[PDB]
Structures are given as structure tokens and as C-alpha cells.
Curated annotation (Swiss-Prot), chain B:
Self-association state and partner proteins as the record states: Homotrimer. Interacts with the capsid vertex protein; this interaction binds the peripentonal hexons to the neighboring penton base. Interacts with the hexon-linking protein; this interaction tethers the hexons surrounding the penton to those situated in the central plate of the facet. Interacts with the hexon-interlacing protein; this interaction lashes the hexons together. Interacts with host dyneins DYNC1LI1 and DYNC1I2; this interaction might be involved in intracellular microtubule-dependent transport of incoming viral capsid.
Organism, as annotated: Human adenovirus F serotype 41 (HAdV-41)
Family stated for the protein in its record: Belongs to the adenoviridae hexon protein family.
Top-level lineage group: Viruses
Functional note: Major capsid protein that self-associates to form 240 hexon trimers, each in the shape of a hexagon, building most of the pseudo T=25 capsid. Assembled into trimeric units with the help of the chaperone shutoff protein. Transported by pre-protein VI to the nucleus where it associates with other structural proteins to form an empty capsid. Might be involved, through its interaction with host dyneins, in the intracellular microtubule-dependent transport of incoming viral capsid to the nucleus.
Expression induction or repression: Expressed in the late phase of the viral replicative cycle.
Bridged cysteine pairs (disulfide): none
Official protein name in the record: Hexon protein
Compartments (UniProt record): Virion; Host nucleus
């Protein structure tokens, strides 16, 4: 967000007194040959460099930052830029003209948090979930305490699938997405229909089934035993996921050999 | 009866140039010679007739 300001403005002096002096490597005999007008319009630069006025540049180094995180929309950085320039062209001083400098050489460096924001989704995945888990009932359900293993598999899923896995709080009911596409929106305040079977050995509306199928991959010997339903189903969903991988590769193979066809004797 | 040829040379809409370079030619702008009296804050004074 700065070199995009460098690569939007500011067309050096070492590179100029490295060429006039003929200290380059590839073609030293470069500056000598130019017309004796250029060679007298580049020698009086690396002999008495001309000052500059950097405000615009680093101000453009701030706009290109805002509009890349999300404030000032892409189409408004022609009013924001003028407004910022005129503000910093009023109150300017070594005061502000520096306070910028720090802002521009910190905003491009203090981007690690932003990177973190999208590397553990600690923006709407764990802060939301670790909020929703605090809206759950007490952590002592009656039947079993396979509860905690499931509720931890949920956190692991949300933390190890950065894709989007956003956890909205679309009003009273917090709902889990499986991707920004969102074609597996399962309601996470509607598994207070699993605070039923948390411990037993057709009452699951697929919404609950959707959550089970969504996390299952991330369950191993955790939700465990023959803890009824919740146990097996998870195991059966994992088995079905493996079989689905098998059938996926099989169908690609059988359609690369060559119409419903494979879809029948696969499904 | 006898002839004493006269002879002219109309030219209209054209401004005689005298371009100022060496090979009185045109190899650019900031033309050769000009380029010399560039930097040198030198000063001169024509006087054509």
C-alpha cells in the first residue's frame, strides 16, 4: 500500500551519479553518448540535488491504504484525497508533515494484525463462537459430557478452515457458514436440539444433521463410544465422507475414460 | 521579333524558413547548435539586414 503509492507516483540520486559518473555495469558508455544538452541537464542534478515536496506522495500512501481495508470506497478516493491534502496543506508543519510519515510507515507495517485477522479468522469466527459458546446452556448437560468434545471440535473447525467460516449473529440465533458462498448455512442456535441426545444409545432435523456432516471430518475418537446416535452418526458421516471421496475420484476416472451413467452405479 | 527572357517565382502561403542548425537541416527540436548556448549563461545579439 506504499509501493503502490511509489508505483503511482515519483517516476533517485545514487542511480543518477552512478550513471553520469559511468559506474554502472551493463552499459557504462550510456550517459556519455547522449546529446550535450541532456549531459548538462543531468550533471547539475548530482552536483546540487533539487529539493522535493513529498506530502502528496505519502498522502497518496494513506488513501491507498484506507481504500484497501475498506473505509473510503474505491470511487471516493478523489474527494478523500483532496480533503486530506487540503487539511494537511493547512495545518501543515514539521508537526503534521511528520505525523504523516509515521502513519504511512506504520500502516504498511502494522498490517500483521490484519493478516492475523484472516489467518485465524479471529474477527468473526472465534470471537463470535467464543461468544456463542458463552450463550450456550451451562457446560453441564444432564445426559453426557461428550458435549465438550463436540463443542471443541466446533472451535477447531472454525479455527482450521479460514476460508470464510463466518459466524454471524443474524439476530437471536448465531448461524455457522461453511463458506462465503454460504450454501451450507446451518443454524447454531438450533442445535439446542442436540441438548437432547447428548447422551443416549429421527428427532434430528437435518439442520442438526447439517452441523454433524459439517464437523464430522474433524472428529476422530472424540465424540465417542456408542454414545448413541451422536456417536455413531458422527462415525457414519465420516465413513460417508470417505466413501464420497472414493466415489468422487471414481466418477472423475469413469468420465475421463469416456449421460447419467456413472451417477447411477455410484449413488 | 527578339526575346529577353524575364523569369519569376511566385510562392504563396509558405514562410521561407532558415532553420538554425548546422547541416541547415532538421534532426530535432533543441537543434544542434542551439543546444550549445544552453547552460552557458551567455548572451549575444543578431542584426540581420
Amino acid at each position: 500500500p506504499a509501493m503502490l503509492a511509489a508505483l503511482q507516483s515519483q517516476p533517485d540520486w545514487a542511480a543518477a551519479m552512478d550513471r553520469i559518473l559511468a559506474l554502472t555495469t551493463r552499459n557504462p558508455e550510456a550517459f556519455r553518448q547522449q546529446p550535450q544538452a541532456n549531459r548538462f541537464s543531468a550533471i547539475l542534478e548530482a552536483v546540487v540535488p533539487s529539493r522535493t515536496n513529498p506530502t502528496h506522495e505519502k498522502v497518496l500512501a494513506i488513501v491507498n491504504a484506507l481504500t484497501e481495508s475498506k473505509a473510503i470506497r474505491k470511487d471516493e478516493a478523489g474527494l478523500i484525497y483532496n480533503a486530506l491534502l487540503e487539511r494537511v496543506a493547512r495545518y501543515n508543519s514539521t508537526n503534521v508533515q511528520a505525523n504523516l510519515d509515521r502513519l504511512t510507515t506504520d500502516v504498511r507495517e502494522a498490517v500483521a494484525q490484519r493478516e492475523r485477522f484472516m489467518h485465524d479468522t479471529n474477527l468473526g469466527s472465534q470471537v463470535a463462537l467464543n461468544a456463542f459458546l458463552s450463550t450456550l446452556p451451562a457446560n453441564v448437560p444432564r445426559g453426557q459430557e461428550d458435549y465438550v468434545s463436540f463443542i471443541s471440535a466446533l472451535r477447531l473447525l472454525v479455527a482450521e478452515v479460514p476460508q470464510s467460516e463466518v459466524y454471524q449473529s443474524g439476530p437471536d440465533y448465531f448461524f455457522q457458514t461453511s463458506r462465503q458462498g454460504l450454501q451450507t448455512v446451518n443454524l447454531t442456535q438450533a442445535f439446542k436440539n442436540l441438548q437432547g441426545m447428548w447422551g443416549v444409545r429421527s428427532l434430528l432435523t437435518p439442520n442438526t444433521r447439517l452441523l454433524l456432516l459439517l464437523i464430522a471430518p474433524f472428529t476422530n475418537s472424540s465424540t465417542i463410544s456408542r454414545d448413541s446416535y451422536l456417536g455413531h452418526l458422527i462415525t457414519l458421516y465420516r465413513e460417508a465422507i470417505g466413501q464420497t471421496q472414493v466415489d468422487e475420484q471414481t466418477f472423475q476416472e469413469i468420465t475421463s475414460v469416456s449421460d447419467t451413467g456413472s451417477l447411477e452405479a455410484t449413488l | 521579333v527578339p526575346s529577353l527572357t524575364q523569369k519569376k517565382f511566385l510562392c504563396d502561403r509558405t514562410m521561407w524558413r532558415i532553420p538554425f542548425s548546422s547541416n541547415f537541416m532538421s534532426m530535432g527540436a533543441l537543434t544542434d547548435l542551439g543546444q550549445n548556448m544552453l547552460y552557458a549563461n551567455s548572451a549575444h545579439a543578431l542584426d540581420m539586414t
